[PDB]
Amino acid sequence: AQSVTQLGSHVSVSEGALVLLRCNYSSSVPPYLFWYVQYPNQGLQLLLKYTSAATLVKGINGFEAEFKKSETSFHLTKPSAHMSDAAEYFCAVSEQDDKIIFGKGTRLHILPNIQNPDPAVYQLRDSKSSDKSVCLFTDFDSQTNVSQSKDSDVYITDKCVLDMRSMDFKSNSAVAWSNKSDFACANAFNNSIIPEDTFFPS
Amino acid sequence: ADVTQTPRNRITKTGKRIMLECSQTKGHDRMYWYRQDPGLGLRLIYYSFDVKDINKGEISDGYSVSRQAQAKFSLSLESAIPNQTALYFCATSDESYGYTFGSGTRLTVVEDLNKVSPPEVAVFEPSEAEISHTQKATLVCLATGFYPDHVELSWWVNGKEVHSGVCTDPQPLKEQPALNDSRYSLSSRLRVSATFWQNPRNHFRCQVQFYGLSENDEWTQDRAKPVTQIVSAEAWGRAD
């Protein structure tokens, strides 16, 4: 088998929804096919493979994939997306009777089901006695995304999802900070489209 | 086999010959070296079917290999350059594509060792406004001023490593994005119940493992030698 194609370096799925990661190959004789997973930042683990036996192959954890030669596909599915499914997935194919060649990989992002969003911008102080601080934008749902800073002295992180197991509670957040003395948390996220009911305490 | 690779982490200057070693115990004929880079998957560098046989993969330029025994397959960067910075994986296979991968070699090639720098680390304490509004409390760790981008951040509550309630940025950002040798920074959050934060018995530590210079390396500057090290910051719970 001369190639394997995954499209979308990053893809999203709603928490609880069908997982579907697409893989297609080019090889006139049916090949062996493999799906590998990689956690940050860890090695590769085999999920499942097609080895010319069952066309529906089942893997660990509810994963399965159907080999379909008539549309040269081997799509990976799982019935319900859990937060622990966040990882990078690689499709791979046999080639030249002597090796495995890897697709470029897709990272799966699971969007938490946030039933009671409570968007807010908080100021946090350094535990030591500078008064350095950072701004924390948190508790917004899936319709919000955070934009890059448009000022080279202000730093803004990508949104990150944490899962507090103690309370079975997930939330989004991004962090902003700057050394500039005119920097205020009220203005930190002005380049992002934030929810109209974002809480801004004093 | 137990496939094993050495070294596990290494930082080097440009221009050096660098050797990575894969070893196996099961004696499979076929061994392989791959590199992994973001957006490109795992690309084959070189592979070998027995002790008499070496063949190029798609990205063999800049590399050589030796198969000195059934059990061993060595990769060399002949003259290291920065674009050889990557995660490297060796693998073995049986005769039916049963692959075994080694656990990885993270290699960072830097132009100028003078620019290596450990992080400064700070913990930022939960807002009273968050505690009041949500009855939850979010700590933020910030690591800054580090180079190269080769760190591992963890959180420690009362001396045990915690994974629940944590989110760490997946990649650091550049402090000076217009510079090729910009320092980096990274943030992480740990969220607990307000209850837990309000207990002055509880101890919270953000730990950053930095990979840098070894004892071997020469160091000519007045500032601290930027050797591989751990840098932490801490906060105690607070009722007031």
Numbering used by the authors:
A (entry chain A): 1 to 202
B (entry chain B): 1 to 240
Article passage:
The key molecular interface that enables T-cells to sense these threats is mediated by the clonally expressed T cell receptor (TCR) that classically distinguishes between self and foreign peptides. The TCR governs T-cell specificity by discriminating between self and foreign peptides presented by MHC molecules. One key feature that is likely to facilitate this level of cross-reactivity is flexibility within the TCR complementarity-determining region loops (CDR loops) that form the antigen contact zone. The finger-like CDR loops of the TCR are thought to meld around specific pMHCs, sampling the peptide cargo, and enabling T-cell triggering by ligands with sufficient affinity/dwell-time.
We generated 12 structures of the F11 TCR, that recognizes a peptide from the influenza hemagglutinin protein (PKYVKQNTLKLAT) presented by HLA-DR*0101 (DR1-PKY), between 1.58 and 1.89 Å resolutions; 5 structures of the DR1-PKY specific HA1.7 TCR, between 2.31 and 2.98 Å resolution; and five structures of the 003 TCR, that recognizes an HIV-GAG-derived peptide (SLYNTVATL) presented by HLA-A*0201 (A2-SLY), between 1.26 and 1.37 Å resolution. Indeed, for the F11 TCR, we observed Cα backbone flexibility in the CDR2β loop, shifting by up to 3.6 Å in different structures of the same protein. In both cases, these shifts were comparable to loop movements reported in several other studies in which the unbound and pMHC-bound TCRs were compared. Moreover, we also observed loop movement for the F11 TCR structures, which were solved at an average resolution of 1.55 Å, comparable to the higher resolution datasets for the 003 TCR. For the F11 TCR, only the CDR2α and CDR2β loops were free from any lattice contacts (data not shown). Thus, the ability of the CDR2β loop to shift between structures could have been partly due to extra freedom imparted by individual crystal packing. However, several other loops in both the F11 and HA1.7 TCR structures were also free from crystal lattice contacts and did not shift between structures. However, we observed several CDR loop re-organizations between structures for the HA1.7 and F11 TCRs, while all structures of the 003 TCR were identical at the level of the Cα backbone. Thus, we conclude that these loop movements represent real differences in the conformation of the CDR loops of the HA1.7 and F11 TCRs due to the intrinsic flexibility of these regions. Although this analysis is an approximation and should be treated as such, the average maximal loop motion was slightly less (6.4 Å) for the 003 TCR compared to F11 (8.7 Å) and HA1.7 (9.0 Å), consistent with the structural data demonstrating greater rigidity in the 003 TCR.
